[PDB]
């Protein structure tokens, strides 16, 4: 599972960004910007929705919030 | 159980809305408007992401698209 391997590494990179954020969450636009600058390549946002053991993505009126699940903080 | 039946109904409602849309696809803002008008309550957009056998939600630059899979 090349895909599973890439998703697993992405989960660690997600953890690394969000463990430094306040309340371990970030607006989606900001997460994308932080990620792409940090790793130097494009984030495929649909991959975040596969990481259901790592993060929840919450809808809000003005945009999504990417939230690190309590066990991963 | 209840969760599967709740998702199963959302699937049927989602298909009904998308069947005759262009390319069986609606921008998310438009799917929400049509859904809320048809069903008279708020759509649980996170539950749509659980319908991985019925729809794909496409990230695009101009906003999300809700797309019925081949079927």
UniProtKB/Swiss-Prot annotation, chain B:
Coiled coil: none annotated. Predominantly present in oocytes and barely detectable in granulosa cells (at protein level). It is found in: Peroxisome. Residues 6-71 form the HTH OST-type domain. Disruption phenotype: Female infertility due to oocyte meiotic arrest at the germinal vesicle stage: ovaries look normal, but oocytes do not resume meiosis even after a superovulatory regimen of gonadotropins and are ovulated at the immature germinal vesicle stage. Oocytes display strong up-regulation of a transcripts, increased retrotransposon expression, defective cytoplasmic maturation, and meiotic arrest. Mutant males are fertile. Interacts with LIMK2. Essential regulator of oogenesis required for female meiotic progression to repress transposable elements and preventing their mobilization, which is essential for the germline integrity. Probably acts via some RNA metabolic process, equivalent to the piRNA system in males, which mediates the repression of transposable elements during meiosis by forming complexes composed of RNAs and governs the methylation and subsequent repression of transposons. Also required to protect from DNA double-strand breaks. This is Meiosis regulator and mRNA stability factor 1. The lineage of its organism: Eukaryota, Metazoa, Chordata, Craniata, Vertebrata. The chain holds residues 860 to 930 of 1730 of the full protein.
């Amino acid at each position: 599972g090349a895909a599973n391997k890439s998703l697993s590494l992405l989960s660690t990179e997600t953890m690394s960004i969000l463990q430094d954020a306040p309340a371990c969450c970030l607006p989606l636009f900001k997460f994308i910007d932080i990620y792409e600058k940090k790793y130097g390549h494009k984030l495929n946002v649909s991959d975040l929705y596969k990481l259901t053991d790592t993060i929840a993505i919450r809808e809000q009126g003005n945009g999504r919030l990417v939230c690190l699940l309590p066990s991963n903080q």
